[PDB]
């Protein structure tokens, strides 16, 4: 009768994009022995993991990474039962299928200027007029 | 015959990383001179692995280093771990026949 489970997959229910930092939600873990999360990034050349000490919260948020490269993100829940060469492995872990997202990128001036109306009485004010190239909210 | 680390919620689950067991000292094992209990595990399918020969221990502990590094490789040929478990235990004489019959998880 005695038995192990690990733990369920996860659903990422979203995720936002920062150009250094990432949101992920995600569904919560049902297995008592759950004792950790990880994550499994995918720069496209190379895969890194990343994984977050304890699952009180429902986000995540993912630091350190290449501003405008697209990422792939799969991870799951790993009881105590996975160890940490099965965890690198990813054996028996049983994590949520990749999800492909876009990473913004960061803003850019395309040229710096100044210009102002010559005036007859007084002084012409002065004002900066400068392009961007950003996609930043504000 | 029970498994002390079994989760609260759902007896047939053990939280943790390994398996810790633990079992009542058989009776009438004082006119015995010797009595070794043989512990029986499985798999999901009935393998016969981990045959212990224990004396005088009222408690065993299954390793995760027992029980990945030892066996998992040795019957699926690869590390990849196993989780669902049997477990069957009875007494043996030192010098006569063993118990009635096996206890059950």
């Known amino acids: 009768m005695i038995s192990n489970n690990a733990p369920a997959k996860m659903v990422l229910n979203s995720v936002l994009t920062g150009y250094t930092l990432a949101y992920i939600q ?3 873990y049902s297995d008592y022995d759950v ?16 994984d977050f000490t304890g699952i009180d919260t429902f986000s995540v948020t993912i630091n350190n990474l290449k501003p405008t490269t697209t990422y792939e993100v799969q991870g799951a829940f790993y009881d105590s039962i996975i160890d940490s060469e099965l965890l690198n492995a990813q054996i028996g872990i049983n994590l949520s299928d990749k999800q492909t997202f876009k990473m913004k990128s960061a803003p850019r001036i395309t040229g710096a200027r100044c210009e102002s ?22 | 015959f029970r498994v002390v680390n079994t989760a609260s919620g759902d007896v047939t689950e053990f939280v943790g990383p390994d398996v810790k067991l633990a079992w009542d000292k058989i009776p009438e094992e004082e006119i015995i001179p010797e009595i070794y209990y043989t512990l029986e595990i499985y798999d999901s399918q009935d393998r016969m692995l981990r045959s212990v020969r ?15 590094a030892d066996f ?34």
């Open chain 1, 117 to 138: 109306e010559p005036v007859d009485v007084g002084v012409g004010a002065p004002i900066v007029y400068i392009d961007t190239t950003g996609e930043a909210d504000y």
């Open chain 1, 26 to 28: 995600h569904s919560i």
């Open chain 1, 35 to 50: 004792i950790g999360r990880s994550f499994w990034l995918k720069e496209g050349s190379n895969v890194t993991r990343r």
């Open chain 2, 72 to 105: 998992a490789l040795l019957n699926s040929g690869a590390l990849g771990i196993n989780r669902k478990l049997r477990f069957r235990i009875r007494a043996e004489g030192e010098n006569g026949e063993q118990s009635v019959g096996w206890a059950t998880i």
């Open chain 2, 54 to 68: 224990i004396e005088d221990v009222y408690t065993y502990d299954y390793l995760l280093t027992y029980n990945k």
